[model samples]
Every structure is written in structure tokens, then in C-alpha cells.
Target chain A: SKPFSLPILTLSELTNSRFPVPIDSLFTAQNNQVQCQNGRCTLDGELQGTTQLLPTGICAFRGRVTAQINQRDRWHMQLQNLNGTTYDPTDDVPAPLGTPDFKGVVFGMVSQRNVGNDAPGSTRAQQAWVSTYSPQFVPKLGSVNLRISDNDDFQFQPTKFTPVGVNDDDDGHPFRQWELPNYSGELTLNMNLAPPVAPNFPGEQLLFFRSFVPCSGGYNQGIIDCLIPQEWIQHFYQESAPSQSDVALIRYVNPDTGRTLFEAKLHRSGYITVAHSGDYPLVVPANGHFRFDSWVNQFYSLAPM
Target chain B: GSKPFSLPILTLSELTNSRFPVPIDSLFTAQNNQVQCQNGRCTLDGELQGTTQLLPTGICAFRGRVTAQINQRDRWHMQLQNLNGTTYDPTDDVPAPLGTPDFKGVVFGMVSQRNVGNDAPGSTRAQQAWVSTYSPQFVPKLGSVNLRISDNDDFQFQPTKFTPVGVNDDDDGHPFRQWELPNYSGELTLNMNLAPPVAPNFPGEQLLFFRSFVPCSGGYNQGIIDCLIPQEWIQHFYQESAPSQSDVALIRYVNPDTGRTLFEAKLHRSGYITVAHSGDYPLVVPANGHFRFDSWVNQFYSLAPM
Candidate 1:
């Protein structure tokens, strides 16, 4: 092949035989990766659990993702969104109630699937929501492409009433108000993973792609008290690849010599060939946009297979 | 002897299971099926009853003066106000956060006679939810209601036209180019004769407004900071002319008088407390002009209907 295909990926899945693995189960790391060799890490089933309510577990992320952190202070799920509700462009819509109910639904996933894992003997043990500690700590591991689908059931009612003693119960009302439980449409969780590698890599990795449901762990399981059971992040890698920074100064250089194959400034839209006078066969980036064909000495479009 | 014709109703399942029109789980039933009526006054089998052929799901559609022009399209708009729009882009690694449920404004008893059926029969419904409430001031009457709903919370629905999202034009699960309401639609006339907390002593005054803001529902969560009370209720006393003073407050965030206090601190008067059997906890506005409640969600007290 003129251009290299994706790498030979080693995808992993938690056996359904031991379904709904307790998130509390201890996790271990060996060589900056989960230890599958020993019992430190176990293959798992699809992520399950409801979303947390707003504010407490609500957050968003910009930049690239390296590894997952468990502590709230250290948590930074790269797959994040605006917290609470989004204010209208004009700020006409108030902050607390102005944003779409979609934020509430998004906030719902805060608990088990993305929030704290507090239940003891239940499914969620020590696990909390996934956050990338120190956006500054760029790992060799990064994500190139991603697609997220939320399969959780959209929970809403004609009217949402607060139970007593909840949220300090200060604003609780004794009567049914004219409030409608804002729905954020469908509760689906479907996503695709693009391993950290250039287009001319040897292998690629694809992890979980399934609709996640909230956990039925605590007393709040069936009750409206909580939505997500626990927040989680599991990354499986086959082999390591050269990583890129948020502002990727990408270069296809010869490891033997200091001579560069190709160089480009990487961004979300696509890569720009800032300096590309090299002596190697042309190849594409993850975006598979225009080719960096050193032999042809020009940029040409080639679709991905 | 002709009054307005009360049209036929349709099944709700058709409405709740769709993609284009927001899947709304409101009320309505099949055609020509009247529950209680005669002489142009008919009670339908479902909450929705509009002209057949494009049977829209709206209060205005609940009755009929069938003109193909005004059939379903004209009436359904009376119950809901939705702007066609887009949705969250799952493709964008950095998503455009879903919009807030906050709308242009809240409208009560807004009626209309425009618009047409968006979904085909069986697939006919929108993406709005419904909520019901009683008029804090009105006496328990047979044909009265205080309804609540949402509108104008628009999002992007389709990326392109001609490219439908579902299988074979069956906009069943397609998210493309489809917009809907997260609004409320329910008849608040439930248990009318069956009184609650306090009995109604006043003659004809009806409930005007009732809104409860919870902490998690996008309100401030500090001590007594996030309950759904409006700022207008600051320092004002419950006016005597407000809804029936003996009628109990339907909300019970943490107050023991949930259904006990007369629609106290009535929304109309902008007051805070109604006399409770235990004690009246009137609104104490802080300097910042916010009325916070003093209760918890886990707490509960029983209410014996009158």
C-alpha cells in the first residue's frame, strides 16, 4: 500500500459471564497501562449507570485526553460538555433554568457512569468518573477520532417534585408547581474510538461501543434520588504509538537519521503542511484529508477505506 | 342545534413513539369516540380531540369545526409552542451542549388555530412532555383547569434535507432535522370534589400561578436558596383576595403543611406563607432579594384529603 493503513489493533472486552463488574474492584497499573497479565485489571462488560444531577458532578473538557483520573479534583473526562444549562447567546435565558433540558439529561449521567462510585458491596466500589489529571500531563496515548451516542433512557415527568430533605431541602415546595421534567431527548451511548496513531500506522484499537445504562446499586437505584451509578473510564491499548500535543507539531522524520519525512501543524479541522520538503513516500494523517506525498511534491485528496 | 363540533381523538402511543415531532406522551384517543357529550357538548375518550384527518394533538383540536384548513394543524398549536430546530452533534468531539429547557416565556391557556399534522397517523406526535397543575385560586369546579407547558426551546434537528434519518422514510428513530417540545399537557381537574390539605372556603376565586423551583432543577442550592419561588414573593404578605385561603398548598418540598396550608403566600399576592397547622413559615427575603425554603427532600408528611 502506498499509504500505511491503521495499525493491527488488539480490542478488549469484559466477558459477559461476569457481567456488571463491580466498579469498586481494585484496578492496578503496570507500565502506565492496566495490568491484564496479573489480576490487577480484568476485561469488563459495557459501562452501566445513570447520570448525576446538575452542578455536583457536572463538567466539560477541552484539548486532548491521555489517561483517566479517579479523584474529583483530578477528574477531567475528555468526553465532557458545558456544565448545568447553556445560556442563550443573548443571556436572555437565565443560567439556572435557561439552558435546554438536555443539560439536565447530560447532568444525569454524572453519577455512576461519569460521577463518583461510592457504594460499598454494590457494583460501583472505588471507581469515580473519569478525568484526565493535569491536561499538562500529555501521555504517549491520545485519541484521534471519537463518536458518542447516549443510549440511556430519557427520564422525565409532566412535573418534577423534590423529595424532602433533598439538596438541603431549603427550596423544596409542598405543592406541585408548573415545572416539566426537561427531557434531553434519547438516552443513547454509542461511540467509536480512534487509537492514537498516524494514518500510516500498522494497527488501530477499538474499545467499547454499546449503550450504557445506569447501575442498580443503591437504594436510590429505583428511586429518583440518583441517576448514574458511578463514573468510569477504561482504556485498552495494543501497542504504543508516538503521541501528539494539543498543538501537534507533527513530523514524519527518519528515526535513523535526523532527516524529516514530512512535517505539519496539526489541529482539529485538519493538518497544514507548514514544511513538507522530505524524501519519504507520501502518507495521510488520521483525518485522511489531503496526502503529504513527499514523492509527488503536492497535496492530493484520497478517501479512507 | 349546533355549537362547535368536538372532533375525534387518537391513541397516545402513536405520539410518544416518533422522531420528527418530539415524542410527547400526552392524552387523546380514537375517532368518533366521545366520552360524555350531546348537543355540541361532548366529552371525548382522550385528552385530545380535534378534527380528524391530520388529527393534531392540541386543546383547540380537542373540539371541532372541521375545515381541512383548520383540521389538525390549526388546533394542536394551541397546546404547545415549538420551534423547528437542531440537536446536539454527537460527532463533534467538543459537543454543542444541549439547550436549556428555559423558553421564551411560560404561557397559560394559550390557544391557536394554525398548524398541520407533522407525523402520519400512528406516528403522529411531538417531542414535548406535559405537566398539570390546579389554579391556586379557583374553587374545585367540574370543567376548570390551570395548565403548564414549555415552548421555544429549539435545537438543530437535521444536518441536511432529502436525506432522512430513519429506515425507508420511517422517521421512527431518526434524530435528523426533527425538533420537538419538552412541554407539559394534562388536565388539572383530577380529584376536584376530593379536596386536599385544607378545604376551600372562598366562593369563586381561582388559582392564578404556581411554580416550584428545586435546587437540582437549575436553581441556587444554598440554604433555602433554590426552591421554585419567584422573586416577586419578596416580603409581601398573602393577600386575602388571593385564591381560596383554606385550600392547601400542593407542594411539599420540606414544609409539613404541604397540602395543609391554604394556597398560602399565594402566587397571585406574591406573598410567602399560608397558615399551616404546625406553624406558618412565611417568606423571609434576604438582602439579595431571593426567597429560600427551609426543608429537605428526604423528609415526608402524609396528607389526608378532605
Candidate 2:
């Protein structure tokens, strides 16, 4: 019915409806930028600002971040579909030729950008990517008054194989909605993330931020982008709109280390343990991952009349 | 190594979301109803048979009969709006003008037809109506139409008979659009007497929907002269051409037995449909029907590249 804290207006959704909004800086546990003035309760125990410690170096770990700007609010970014240049007869959006797919999810906030590990002599970091930026971190939101849902890790199930049961045609294949986690919160957010961090101590570390008014309980409508319901694909004209979308906020971050990338350039390739959601999942040994309870953010449903 | 296109398969979920464009052939099946295979075809009878209902002949393609209904809980429609006139007014009962405007007695037919062919306020070519099963009509020859509610007793909303949108003649205020047509789920019965049945969805209210406005002769209402083409007119429509009963049929939107209704009506057809040299598109729509507030028809009327 209500939420924990109000979302910081400007810093909350940092993007216009124009460009690809950042998705790397929106997930953080620092409700307060000092990165040490807030508290969040995890499954294991309560994480008080003073009790937890900052990730000064790189190591294998997992957790999530929840942050909202106090003094830093006027900040945003644009997130859109591949620059409105391509024509996909499939989407009925009819977005003006150059308009980003108006589905709204085109932009979201990420927690951080740099995978940093600090040492007196040198520093190693996680790899930072953008064009076709791919990551495991999903998006969710809660704050103001409305709650937008997010799809679970969106790895579109390739169309070649038959997906879960949702149809009964010989084509055998059908669309599988994006798997979503139950959630509730007007402006809260949830994400599966990894901060950049070099397993090599004193190396690079992944970092991002998150913010919201915690919530829980709602349908995690999965995705069916890859497989077309055998019957539907055959009679496309009758179909009307996308199954359903789980909305979220995307954030972006620019993480840079003040060091000379030299001859033995450490090809940054890992994430960090920004704060703590749980044990983070990193390609390399890094403590970073998103976490929350099933009843955190609730979802609302509109039946098909 | 690749040509201009490849098979990009998206899910049904993607299909419904307008992520892709659907073709007309996919939704309708062509049935060779006429002796001359390519001349044009129509379903002469049983437009709504048990699970095998044919489509209305007037709108079927030229010699290429098409037929089919939407999946359960779904439909196809052809809709229009903001036109100058409406369907024939039974209450007004303006004697048929004998002139071309005779269609206007049926109110919105002209507007729906003209609007689709780009004869309305916008466009240089014809348009695709919001085709669905909610508003159905038949055009053995060619005719135009629109979806609207006019000012008259015979063509009034169930809620209006009491008073107006809110305050009734009795002084009680109510939500005007609360009455919704119930969904039909059993045997498809054809030719059921369409005397406004007890509101299936809004039972207890026992409200009846006005089919169309009955124009006033002097100042008295003659009622909707005929909601369904008088049994005789339907026959007349059949007589327009011969040996087509198998392809020509009346689609009853309401089921009389259970007093249930199929307010959503539709007629499907295929290629080579005719509108007007200037405005005849809505006349032979491939898909159409009536939702609670309006009627519609959607047919593929192919035109030459400008």
C-alpha cells in the first residue's frame, strides 16, 4: 500500500525518451551518497552502514545496492532502441521513423561502470562495454507512486527450439514471456548485477548503484520473444500487441581508474560487490550480484476483457 | 551470402504486440463457391454453422470465397468514425429518396465507406478499418457505413431509454456505458429472432439495445422498421444474383434460445473488393462486426501505387 522512502526525482530515472539510457549506475545500496549512511535488511542479517565495510580491493563476493540521491538529483540519460534507423515490419509501434521503440523499456539505470581493485603501485578493473551492451542485471522500480516491473535476465529463448507450454499447434514452438520475479514498490528496483573488479587484489573492481522504496509481491510475467505461438505466427493479422512487458529503470556509469593502461594492459573483465544483495555473480572472481525477497515489490495485473 | 530477407521467427507473444505485420491470407481461408473459380466466390449458406460457419458473400473476394472466425475470446473487426451521417433512421422513416442518398436512410453507411477510400477529411487513398467481429454488415453489391449512435428512440443505448447518459426520465442518474454485450459460448444458432433480449451481461436491468434509429413520419416513432433485413429483403439480397444461397447467408449476432447475444458481428472476404471510383472501399470489407458502442468492417481493397 505504501513505500519506505521517496525516490530522488532527478537522479531516479536519468534519461529522456531519446537515447539509450544508462543501465550501469542505477543499482546501489547507498541511499545516501556517502555510501555509508543507509541500511538494508538482507536474508541473512541487517546491513547497517557502520557494520558493513567498503570493497577497497577485488575479491569473490555477491550483493546488491539500493541508493537515492539526496543532494545529487538533477541527473539523467537517454535510452532507446537501435538508433531509429532500422525498419522492423514486425513491431506495430509505428513510432515516428526516427523515434526509439516507444515501449518505454528502451532506457534504464545501472548501478556502476568500473570494476576496480586499488593497490599502491597499480590497479586492475572489470571490462566496460556499451554498444550492444549485454549483462545479467535486470531492472525494477519503486518510489513516487507507480511501480514498473522488470523482466528476469532477458536471454531471449532462441526460436529454433520449442519453449514452455502456452500453445497447442504442430509448429510446436511458442513465445515465452520474459521470466519476472515477484515484486512491489512504487519506485523501488531489483536487478541481477555484477560490479567490475579484478580478482587480482589491488586490481579493477566493478561498481554501480541502485535506489528505491522497497516493495514485494507481483507476477513475474516471463518473456516469449524468440518462439512464436505456432498458431499465432500462422495468422499474424489477428494478433494485436506484445504479450506483456515488465518495466524497469536503467542507469549508466562511467568508471575510470587514474592509472596508465600500459604494455601489459589488463583487459578489464569482471564485476564488483558494490554493496551487498547477496553473493554477487561475476564471470571472474568478484563479489557482486542483485538480491531481494519474493515479497519485496508487488505487481499489478490487467485482465484480458 | 544472404538475400534481402530471412525467416525471422518471433513468438506469438511478439506477434500480438504489433512487433510484426500480419497478412490477410493467414486469417481467412478461400472456398471456391462459384462455378467460375476465378470470377468471385461467396458462402451461399450457414454463415455461422456449428464450428464451420461460412462468411457473408457480399464482401468475399471476387470469385475467391473466404471464411473463418476468431479464436475463442478474440475477434476481427472493421470500424469507422466521425462521419457526416449514420445508418438508416427507422423512426424518422424518411421515405426512400430514390436518389443515391437512399443509403443515408441507413445512417452512417456513406461515411464508413467514404472515409475508408480516403474520401473523408484525410488521405489520398483508401484506409484499413478497425476490423473485428464486434460490428458486422453485408453488402451483396457495394455500400458504405460508419459506426455511431444517432439521436432517436429506436437507435438508443440500453441506458438511454431511461433518460439520457445519466439522469433518467425518473430522475435517477446512472453510468451510461455500463451495459456490455455478453460473450456467447455454445452452439452457433443462426436466424434467431433479434427482438432485444434481456441484457445477458446486465441482467436484472433487462435493458434492450436499439438496433438503429427509427426516423419519425410526422412525429411518431415506427420503431426500427427492421433490425434484420425483413425476411423478404434478405431474400431480395439473395436474388441479386443466383445459385449463391450456398454462399449468401444471414449472420445472426444474437442467439434467441438462451436469449444470449453475439453483439460482435463480422464478415470476412478476400482480394479484389470494390469501394467507389472515389469512395466504395467499406462496401466489401473482408472483416467486420459491432462492439457495444459502434460497428465496423475491415477488408483488403487493393489499390494501384500512386
- Model 1: per-residue lDDT, tens digit, B108-226? 11111112255221111111211121113111122111222222332112111110001110123322111121121123423211101212123322222112111121111110111
Superposed by TM-score, candidate 2 places the C-alpha of residue B24 at a distance from the truth, in angstroms, of: 16
Q: In model 2, what lDDT does residue A78 have?
A: 20
Candidate 1 lDDT over residue span A1-305, tens digit each: 12211111111111111111111111111111110100111112122111111111112212222233342233322221222222232222111221111111111111111112422211110111211122221111211111111213111111111101001011222111112211121232212211121222122111111111121111111111111111111110111122222223334344345454444433221112243222222332222221122322123222211
lDDT score for residue B126 of model 2: 12
Q: Which portions of model 1 miss their true places by more than 4 Å?
A: A1-305, B1-74, B77-194, B197-282, B286-306
* TM-score on alpha carbons, each prediction: 0.18, 0.16
- Could you tally the backbone clashes for each prediction? 115, 188
Best by TM-score: 1
Estimate, for each residue in B103-207, the C-alpha lDDT of model 2 and write its tens digit. 112111100111122223211111111111122332211221112222112221110000000000101221111122111111242311111221112111111
Which 10 residues in a row give candidate 2 chain B its minimum summed lDDT? B159-168
